[PDB]
Structure formats: C-alpha cells, structure tokens
C-alpha cells in the first residue's frame, strides 16, 4: 500500500501499478473503489464512473490505469483499491490488487 499526501485544491493521481494494452481491454475487468464503495468500472472496454465520482474523476487507461481527482477536498481523503481481472479459458481470475491511501491536507 502507498501512502500519498496531497494538498487541498490540488489534483491527486493514484496509480494501479498495472499497464493494460488496448487489445487486452476486451478481456479485462478493472475495478477502482474507495473505502469499499465503487468509484468506476472498466468492464471489457466499457467504462462506468459512479455518480459521486463522475464530475471530478479522470480515468487514464494508458497511464497505469490511474485515476485523477481534480480539486481535492478533505472528503476525497481515504483508502483506494484497484483490481484487475483477466479472463482466461473459463472465467475471470484476479490479476492485480493496488492499495493507496490519500491524505488531503491544508
């Protein structure tokens, strides 16, 4: 787990530590969540950002499946979890887990 410290009104980029090629997207499922609450899902090429994260979050797929949070507020502070699932023969097996805690300070 990475403990990142950022300042209020800044942008935080939290990395998944995993790069997926555009061809591999069709058979990969990406799950970013904060404090066990869903943030966004890249489901076999289909991105879905959750309503509390639509307005300020960017999903940089080409950059280590990172998420950018513009205009940090103390609310944004919390633990973030990124999950990767690659489909292989039967169904989707877990490939990667990324944990990163955001500390938004004055």
């Amino acid at each position: 787990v990475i403990h990142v410290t950022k300042e209020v009104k800044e942008v935080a980029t939290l990395s998944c530590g995993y790069n997926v090629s555009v061809e591999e997207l069709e058979q990969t499922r990406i799950y970013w969540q904060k404090d066990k609450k869903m943030v966004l899902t890249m489901m076999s090429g289909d991105l879905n950002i959750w309503p509390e994260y639509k307005n300020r979050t960017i999903f940089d797929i080409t950059n280590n499946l990172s998420i950018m949070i513009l205009g940090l507020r103390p609310s944004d502070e919390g633990t973030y979890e990124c999950v990767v699932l690659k489909y292989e023969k039967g169904a989707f097996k877990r490939e990667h887990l990324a944990e990163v805690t955001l500390s938004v300070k004055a």
Partner: protein, 209 residues
C-alpha cells in the same frame, strides 16, 4: 464530458504572444462554482482555477508575469492559456485538466523557434584617408550560427565572429561578427547567419553611405 483541442501542436516564434486553447462543453450559462481548470507543463504548475478561485502562489516562478488564464473565454467553453513574450524555456508538453459536469484532459506540444531574424547592423568609418570601414552584424538565436560575409559579387570575405550566451535567456546565443574592409560608397555587402540541420540562413544587406 470531453475536452478538445483545435491544435495539438503550436510552433511559436521566440518573443511572440501565444495562446493555447482547450475547449469543453458549456450549456447556456457558466456555473463558475462548478468549474475546475488546471494548466501545467510537464512538472511545472501554471494555472490552478478551482470553483472560480485562482491561486497565484501555485504558479511556477518561470511563468510569473507572463502566463494568464483568459476568464472571458471560459464563458464560451474555452480554457485559453496566454503566455506573453514566449521564451525557449516554454517549449514542452502542456496539459489542461478540466472539470465541469465531468472531467477530461488534453496535451498540447509547444515548439519555440528562435531564428536570427532581427539582425542589428553598424557601418563605421575607421579611416577616411584609406576608406577603411568596419561593418558589424549582430543577432540572437538558437542554436549557434556562423556568420558569413559576402561582397557585392557574392565572394566570401574574412570577418571576426564572437559567440556568447544571451543575457535575456541563458539557452539563447548572441552572435556578433565584424568585417574590416577598405571600401567605397554605395557598395553592397551581405552578412549571413547560417544555422544547420535544418539549414536556415538569415542575411542582412549593408550599404556604405
């Protein structure tokens, strides 16, 4: 929500006033409180505009007094970054990050061209008895350039060239060349500032009065 750019590459003349733009959707009115715009260049912070509040303390020292976000354009769905008196240091990859009912970003590459366009010349009489004159050509540019002197009939003449760095910007060069020749009135001379790969030549015509 999608951020768009008219040009993904800007090639700008050194000393110019450049405005790079990022467009984002706006419907009827602009809710200033819901708007976030950031402009950065690689590792340097340029603009931080969150919910209608711009912090100047966040802006990088190299951009102070020269960079500004045109807030009049925001109404039109245009985040326009204006940089006045563009330096060689401004060449690089810019990126705008915008949030207004969704978020997105776009990258702009800026290339700064510093030609030896503004050639300063001086013709002085050294000795009128022997009609000796001293001709000088001086220009600033990047990268280094050699100076070539030619007669009216295009034959090369030997001069003395001094190359130092510009005081205005450390990367920029200040090239000055001097030709001493016994010459008469109304004769034409040429000083050429040759820069290589890509080969580019800037010549000034000097007429002895």
């Amino acid at each position: 929500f999608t951020v768009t750019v008219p040009k993904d590459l800007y090639v700008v003349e050194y000393g110019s006033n450049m405005t790079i733009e990022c467009k984002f959707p706006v419907e009827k009115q602009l809710d200033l409180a819901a708007l976030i715009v950031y402009w950065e260049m690689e590792d340097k912070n340029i603009i931080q505009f969150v919910h209608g509040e711009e912090d100047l303390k966040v802006q990088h020292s190299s951009y102070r007094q020269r960079a500004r976000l045109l807030k009049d354009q925001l109404s039109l769905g245009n985040a326009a970054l204006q940089i006045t008196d563009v330096k060689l240091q401004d060449a690089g990859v810019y990126r705008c990050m915008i949030s207004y009912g969704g978020a997105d970003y776009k990258r702009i590459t800026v290339k700064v061209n510093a030609p030896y366009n503004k050639i300063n010349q001086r013709i002085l009489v050294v000795d009128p008895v022997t009609s000796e004159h001293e001709l000088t050509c001086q220009a600033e540019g990047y990268p280094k350039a050699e100076v070539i002197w030619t007669s009216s009939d295009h034959q090369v003449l030997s001069g003395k060239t001094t190359t130092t760095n510009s005081k205005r910007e450390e990367k920029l060069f200040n090239v000055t060349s001097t030709l001493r020749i016994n010459t008469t009135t109304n004769e034409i001379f040429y000083c050429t500032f040759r820069r290589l790969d890509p080969e580019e030549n800037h010549t000034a015509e000097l007429v002895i009065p």
